[PDB]
Design an enzyme around this catalytic site. Structure first.
Site: not given
Ligand SMILES: N[C@H](CCC(=O)N[C@@H](CSC[C@H](O)CCc1ccccc1)C(=O)/N=C\C(=O)O)C(=O)O
Ligand SMILES: N[C@H](CCC(=O)N[C@@H](CSC[C@H](O)CCc1ccccc1)C(=O)/N=C\C(=O)O)C(=O)O
Ligand SMILES: N[C@H](CCC(=O)N[C@@H](CSC[C@H](O)CCc1ccccc1)C(=O)/N=C\C(=O)O)C(=O)O
Ligand code: NI
Lengths: 147, 147, 147
Positions: A33, A54, A56, A60, A95, A98, A106
Site C-alpha cells: 500500500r 526480508a 521472503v 524460506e 533482521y 533492519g 538487516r
Molecule cells: N536468495 C538468496 C538465497 C540464499 C540465502 O538465503 N542465504 C542465506 C545465508 S547462508 C548462511 C548460513 O548458511 C545459514 C543458513 C543455515 C541453514 C540451515 C542451517 C543452518 C544455517 C541468507 O542470505 N539468509 C537471509 C538473507 O538473505 O538475508 C539470497 O539472496 O541470499
C-alpha cells in the site's frame, strides 16, 4: 499418558514463529500500500523490494528452523532447543526491521539468527549421534570378536 | 501401543495438502507451456504471472498451515484442527482457481483461508495456554503463601 | 519409554536435508559474489538466475518432502520412507548441480527426485488407508446388518 508435556515448549516456540511470520506478511502488505504495488508483481521502490525480500527470506528459512528445532528438542534437549529458537526468532524480527530500513541494517540480526540456527543443527547432530553411534560401535566390536 | 490413532486425521489432512500443492505446481507448469515461458525466468503474460503467484503464495503459506494444524490438533483437539485444515485447503484451491483467472477472483477464497488459519492459531494458543497457565499460576500462588 | 528409536532415521534424513538446504543457500550467495548481484534484487547473468532458481525450487519443495516423509514413515514404514528420502535428497543435490551449469542438466536429477517424492506420497496414502479403511468398512457392514 500424553506427551504434550515433553513438547509443549517446542510447540509454543513454533506458534510464536508462526505469529511472527504472519507479522512479516502483514508488514509486506503494508509496504504494497505505502509504495503503490498491486498484486501480482513484486517490483517498486527500493524500500518495498527490501521489505518484501526480508519477508521472503524469513519465509524460506522458517521450515529449516522448525525441522532443526524439533529434531534438536527431541534428540538433544527441549529447553536448549526452545531457547535457541527464541534467540533465532528475535534475531529474525530484528533482521526484518533492519532490512525494511536499509539493506545493510538487516546484517547484524541476520548473523545472530544464523548462529542460533547452526547451534540448533549441532544439537540435532549431537543428539542423533548419541542415539546411533553406541549401537553402531557395539555391533562393529561384536563382529571384531570373532576371533 | 502406537499413537497413529491420535494423529491419523492430521496426517490425512497434511497429505491432502501435499497433493493439493503438487496440483498447484503442475498447473503452473501448464501455464509455462500455454504462455511460452521457459525456465529459469518467471515473467510472461499477466495470466502466467498470476497463476505462478497463486502457487508461490500457497507454497509460502503451506508450512504455516502445517505447523498450526499440528500444534492445534495435539494441544487443543484433533478433529477441530483437521476440519479447519480442510476448510483452509478448499479455500486455497478456490484461491488458486480465482487467481489464475483474475487477480480480483483470488480474493474471496483468500479471506476464507485466512480465517481458518487464524482459527487454527487461536486453538493452538488456547491449547498451549491450557497446558502452561495452571502450573504457572499455581507456582505463583505457592510463592505468595509465604506469609 | 521414549519414541526416539521409532523416528531416529526420519530425524537423521530430515537433518541431512536441512544441511543440504544450507548448502544450496551458500552456493547461491557464492553466485551473488561471482556474478556481482547485491541484495535485494535477484537478476543478473543467466548462470546466477539458474543457480538461484535451483535453490528457490529446492526450498519450495523441502516442506513437501518433510511432510510426506514423516507421514509415510509413521504410517507405512520408517526405513522405506528414509530410503526414499535419501534418494530424493541425492537427486536434489544433483538437480542443483545440473541447474547451476545449464537449465537442461537439472532435468535428469529432477525426474529422480519427483519419483521418490511420489513414492513417499503413495506410501503415505497406503499407510493412512490401512489405518482408516478397515474401521470404516466394518462400520458400514454393521449398519448393513440390519436386517
Ligand atoms: N536468495 C538468496 C538465497 C540464499 C540465502 O538465503 N542465504 C542465506 C545465508 S547462508 C548462511 C548460513 O548458511 C545459514 C543458513 C543455515 C541453514 C540451515 C542451517 C543452518 C544455517 C541468507 O542470505 N539468509 C537471509 C538473507 O538473505 O538475508 C539470497 O539472496 O541470499
Ligand atoms: N508477497 C507478499 C506476501 C505477503 C502475504 O503473503 N500476505 C498474505 C496475507 S496476510 C493476512 C493474514 O495475516 C493471514 C496470514 C496468517 C499467517 C499465520 C497465521 C494466520 C494468518 C497474503 O497476501 N496471502 C496470499 C495472497 O497473497 O493472496 C504479497 O504479495 O502479499
Ligand atoms: N516456479 C514454477 C513452479 C512449479 C514447479 O515447481 N513444478 C515442479 C514440477 S511438478 C512434478 C510433480 O508434480 C512433482 C511434484 C510433487 C509434489 C508433491 C508430491 C509429489 C510430487 C518443478 O518444476 N520442480 C522443480 C523444478 O522447477 O525444476 C516452475 O518454474 O516450475
Ligand atoms: Ni508415547
Amino acid at each position: 499418558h500424553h506427551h504434550k508435556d515433553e513438547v509443549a515448549l517446542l510447540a509454543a516456540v513454533t506458534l510464536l514463529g508462526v505469529l511472527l511470520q504472519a507479522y512479516f506478511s502483514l508488514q509486506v502488505i503494508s509496504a504494497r500500500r505505502a509504495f503503490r504495488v498491486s498484486p501480482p508483481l513484486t517490483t517498486g521502490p527500493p524500500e518495498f523490494e527490501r521489505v518484501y525480500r526480508a519477508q521472503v527470506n524469513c519465509s524460506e528459512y522458517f521450515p529449516l528452523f522448525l525441522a532443526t528445532l524439533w529434531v534438536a528438542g527431541i534428540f538433544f534437549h527441549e529447553g536448549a532447543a526452545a531457547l535457541c529458537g527464541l534467540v533465532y526468532l528475535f534475531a529474525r524480527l530484528r533482521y526484518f526491521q533492519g532490512y525494511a530500513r536499509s539493506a545493510q541494517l538487516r546484517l547484524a540480526p541476520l548473523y545472530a539468527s544464523a548462529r542460533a540456527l547452526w547451534l540448533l543443527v549441532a544439537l540435532a547432530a549431537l543428539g542423533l549421534l548419541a542415539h546411533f553411534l553406541p549401537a553402531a560401535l557395539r555391533a562393529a566390536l561384536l563382529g571384531r570378536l570373532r576371533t
